[PDB]
């Protein structure tokens, strides 16, 4: 057998092995050096097209030969030396001088039209253009370059829902010309979104088929029913013809995915919302967190899709209102523009109103997002949740949004089946780790925080009762005996946040 390297050479030199070559010329020269069998040679000598004899010759060869020798010692003799020179050059710039391979023997054939072919065939989604989050896409490309050497590895581009991860990955595999061709030969980008237990097998059914040639897409068997060990073996088999292949797993929810990806020694980019699935993998795991759009990048984004920039003070305020409300979120921001109809700052403040007294449903729209509104996403994010975490979350409604607040201030509303409430913190952490629903902030004092979108989700969604119950159940503990945290001399009066409490009391009485 060859390996991933010698096959990466056989794959890189394929435009050439297609432009000038013929397996009949080599069948005779190779039956001698012992790398074939008379059915092997039978299968390859009688084939109507040359592309057939070639695909069978390169498939059979990658399995049969002890090395990549008797194919250099042939393109030479056949006056097709323009081939054997390329492959010996690549193998020498592989064994002796490594690294030098990507700049020297790999780069001089890049072509911004070959890329597009590989992306399209690898089901990579069309990269976004009117704005690119520079930083993140850059660091993705960097950290992918650092690992193209590795035999298997995980890159987790994890964030909130609609935070823009998949899109960032779309751009990260579409910006450079290096990642596909130079660093990795091919791309297989598959959308997961699996919740059922059958989803994790079906996914890899479509991997197994994403690999397979346009030929033998016809031969697909009733593979729907076939063991996991066999789909897996069929893959690590069919994975030979795919040297350095990058795998994007857009929207992973089940850690079962990650376990298959890691048993199959695959190279994976993973977009996901729940981060803990990575504890499933014992391996090179690296992370890139897609934070909420900073206040300035949102400006950039607005400018980016034709948005008139403020003048009056209560217009920059209208837009900081939007950025606070849609607590830095690509998707709801896009829905926001798409729903800003006349384009005026006026109708923009209209929406800013519409958002508090009709929730996200005031701006739900047809958007590049698969979802009409962010509530459909967090939906899923909330179903997967530990039952108790579903509870804690169900209660974090009755807080003040966009405010940093202490653990005890949380211990009051958050459930638990004594005197040390850190269990609250453990829950609020799982809660920020798993869909990025909270927000942990270690010092000055161990405090969490709930954002505004992540709040107004819960507003028009939790039981109208459970709100008022949390407000009163809070008003009990409420007495016992700015960029500044609320002091322990003053917790007894949460009345500082009366505004954001009068709005819930008014709410739950309608």
């Amino acid at each position: 057998m060859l390996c991933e390297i010698e096959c990466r050479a056989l794959s890189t030199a394929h435009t050439r092995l297609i432009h000038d070559f013929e397996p009949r010329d080599a069948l005779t020269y190779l039956e001698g050096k012992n790398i074939f069998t008379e059915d092997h040679s039978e299968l390859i000598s009688k084939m109507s097209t040359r592309l057939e004899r070639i695909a069978n010759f390169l498939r059979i060869y990658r399995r049969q030969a002890s090395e990549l020798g008797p194919l250099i010692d042939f393109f030479n003799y056949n006056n097709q030396s323009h081939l054997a020179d390329f492959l010996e050059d690549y193998i020498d710039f592989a064994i002796n001088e490594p690294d030098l391979l990507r700049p020297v023997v790999i780069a001089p054939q890049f072509s911004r039209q070959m890329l597009d072919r590989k992306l399209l065939l690898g089901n990579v989604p069309k990269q976004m253009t009117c704005y690119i989050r520079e930083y993140h896409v850059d660091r993705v490309i960097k950290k992918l370059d650092e690992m193209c050497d590795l035999d298997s590895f995980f890159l987790f581009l994890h964030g909130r829902a609609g935070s823009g991860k998949s899109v960032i990955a779309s751009q990260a595999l579409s910006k450079s010309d290096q990642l596909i061709g130079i660093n990795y030969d091919s791309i297989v980008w598959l959308k997961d979104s699996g919740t059922a237990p059958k989803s994790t097998f079906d996914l890899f059914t479509d991997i197994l088929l994403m690999l397979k040639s346009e030929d033998d897409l016809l031969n697909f068997p009733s593979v729907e029913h076939v063991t996991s060990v066999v789909l897996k073996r069929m893959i690590c088999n069919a994975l030979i013809d795919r040297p350095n292949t990058l795998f994007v797993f857009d929207d992973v929810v089940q850690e079962e995915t990650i376990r298959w990806a890691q048993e199959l020694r695959l190279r994976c980019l993973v977009t996901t919302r729940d981060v803990e699935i990575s504890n499933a993998a014992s391996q090179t795991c690296e992370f890139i967190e897609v934070t909420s759009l900073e206040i300035d990048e949102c400006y950039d984004f607005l400018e980016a899709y034709g948005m008139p920039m403020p003048v009056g003070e209560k217009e920059e305020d209208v837009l900081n209102k939007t950025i606070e409300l849609s607590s830095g979120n690509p998707a709801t921001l896009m829905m926001f523009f798409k729903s800003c109809e006349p384009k005026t700052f006026e109708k923009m403040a209209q929406l800013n109103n519409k958002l508090e007294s009709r929730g996200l449903v005031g701006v739900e729209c047809i958007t590049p997002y698969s979802y009409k509104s962010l509530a459909m996403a967090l939906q899923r994010c909330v179903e997967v949740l530990s039952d108790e975490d579903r509870s804690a979350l169900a209660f974090a409604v009755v807080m003040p949004p966009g405010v940093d607040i202490p653990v005890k201030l949380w211990s009051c509303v958050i459930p638990v089946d004594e005197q040390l409430d850190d269990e609250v913190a453990d829950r609020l952490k799982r809660l920020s780790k798993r869909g990025a629903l909270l927000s942990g902030k270690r010092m000055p004092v161990l405090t969490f925080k709930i954002d505004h979108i992540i709040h107004m989700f819960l507003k028009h969604v939790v039981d109208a009762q459970t709100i008022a119950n949390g407000i009163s159940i809070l008003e009990q503990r409420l007495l016992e005996i700015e960029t500044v945290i609320r002091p322990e001399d003053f917790p007894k009066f949460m009345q500082l946040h009366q505004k954001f409490y009068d709005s819930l009391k008014n709410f739950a009485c309608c």
Binding site: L378, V382, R390, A394, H460, V461, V462, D463
Partner: peptide
């Protein structure tokens, strides 16, 4: 409790 989970 959770208007159809969301």
């Amino acid at each position: 409790m959770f208007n159809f989970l969301g």
